[PDB]
């Protein structure tokens, strides 16, 4: 219920939030700024007027951080931040669930549902890691890329509105063994961006399977 952020670490400072709650605040639930690192292993940060957690050129380390109903990006890293959350459970974010903004985010087995926009997104450089991430009920896209790479060795994107996975202006989506389920074209490529995946499940593709084009190359093999 604070006017500004819930817990903030700034200018090379450490804070530990092992199971604490940062709810209802008028700004970002947890924010690291300029090299500071907070640790939120099992925190609960839901309902805030802004991002559930933000990394303004600082590190955030989580294990099963809970987010819900935040006013904007549930997890966000920018200007060199790094948000690590092996089992983050984000949901019901008004904007993007988790967005990497020129920085790296590591959600290996996150389960994220009912986003108001893209399930995950890596815009303006940066990378996002994923191993068995579960998307459900996304707003626009299950996965998105803007000159940025997203790795998902397996996934379960479902209930997405427009397109399961989208790649633009470069950037890979190494979604190999994904169990995607959607009516629209599954794998999408635009403006010279690559996608790599398996051929075990026949999924609709925007471009011919394994040939170059003006749009990027796909390897359905």
């Amino acid at each position: 219920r604070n006017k500004w952020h819930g817990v903030i670490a700034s200018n090379n400072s450490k804070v530990d939030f092992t199971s604490g709650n940062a709810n209802e605040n008028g700004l970002d639930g947890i924010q690291c700024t300029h090299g500071s690192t907070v640790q939120a292993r099992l925190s609960t940060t839901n309902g805030n007027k802004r991002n559930g957690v933000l990394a303004y050129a600082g590190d955030v380390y989580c294990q099963e951080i809970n987010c819900d109903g935040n006013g904007r990006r549930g997890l966000e890293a920018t200007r060199g931040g790094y948000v690590a959350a092996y089992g983050a459970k984000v949901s019901r974010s008004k904007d993007d669930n988790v967005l990497a903004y020129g920085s790296m985010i590591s959600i290996n087995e996150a389960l994220i549902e009912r986003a108001g926009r893209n399930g995950i997104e890596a815009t303006r450089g940066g990378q996002i890691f994923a191993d068995r991430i579960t998307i459900t009920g996304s707003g626009d896209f299950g996965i998105l890329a803007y000159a940025s790479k997203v790795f998902a060795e397996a996934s379960n994107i479902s209930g997405t509105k427009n397109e399961p996975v989208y790649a633009t202006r470069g950037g890979e989506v190494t979604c190999f063994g994904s169990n995607i389920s959607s009516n629209k074209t599954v794998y999408n490529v635009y403006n010279g961006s690559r996608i790599f995946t398996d051929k075990d499940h026949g999924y609709s593709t925007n471009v011919d399977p394994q040939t170059l084009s003006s749009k990027g190359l796909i390897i359905l093999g």
Partner: protein, 152 residues
């Protein structure tokens, strides 16, 4: 044998617990930052408290032969199992025959409290409390049920 028990209670449960275990004056904060203030054992000031708000309260449950126990299970020396609600251990007609008595924790989990004719000490009770329900998976469910109330 006094056992701390930390729990999270909604507003109704918190009010009930506070009035049963008399609190003269105290402020209870919630999960989502809302608070309720008791003054002279009467509710005075409550912030914006939504449903499903959780308040943390620790209550001491003491296990003694003379005081009543809400729910326990008794095994006779012959082999009969019986259950007793809200009576003290000494209130049994023939405590001579009783061999073992297990407390019941509303999870259908039994914790041994009485064996070999004597109460179980505090540390063995802690061991049994850890030991009774090891593989207890609780349903994971999270709803914020709130947003910064003011216009900012």
């Amino acid at each position: 044998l006094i056992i701390k028990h930390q729990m999270k209670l909604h507003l109704n449960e918190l009010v009930d617990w506070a009035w049963r275990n008399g609190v003269t004056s105290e402020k209870f904060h919630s999960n989502n930052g809302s608070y309720v203030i008791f003054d002279h054992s009467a509710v005075v000031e409550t912030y914006i408290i939504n449903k499903n708000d959780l308040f943390n309260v620790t209550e001491e449950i003491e296990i003694t032969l003379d005081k009543p126990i809400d729910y326990f299970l008794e095994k006779d020396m012959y082999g009969n199992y019986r259950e007793h609600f809200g009576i003290a251990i000494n209130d049994l007609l023939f405590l001579n025959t009783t061999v073992n008595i297990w407390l019941v924790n509303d999870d259908n989990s039994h914790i041994l409290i009485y064996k070999d004719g004597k109460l179980i000490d505090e540390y063995m009770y802690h061991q049994f409390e850890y030991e009774a329900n090891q593989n207890k998976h609780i349903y994971p469910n999270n709803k914020a049920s709130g947003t910064y109330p003011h216009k900012t």
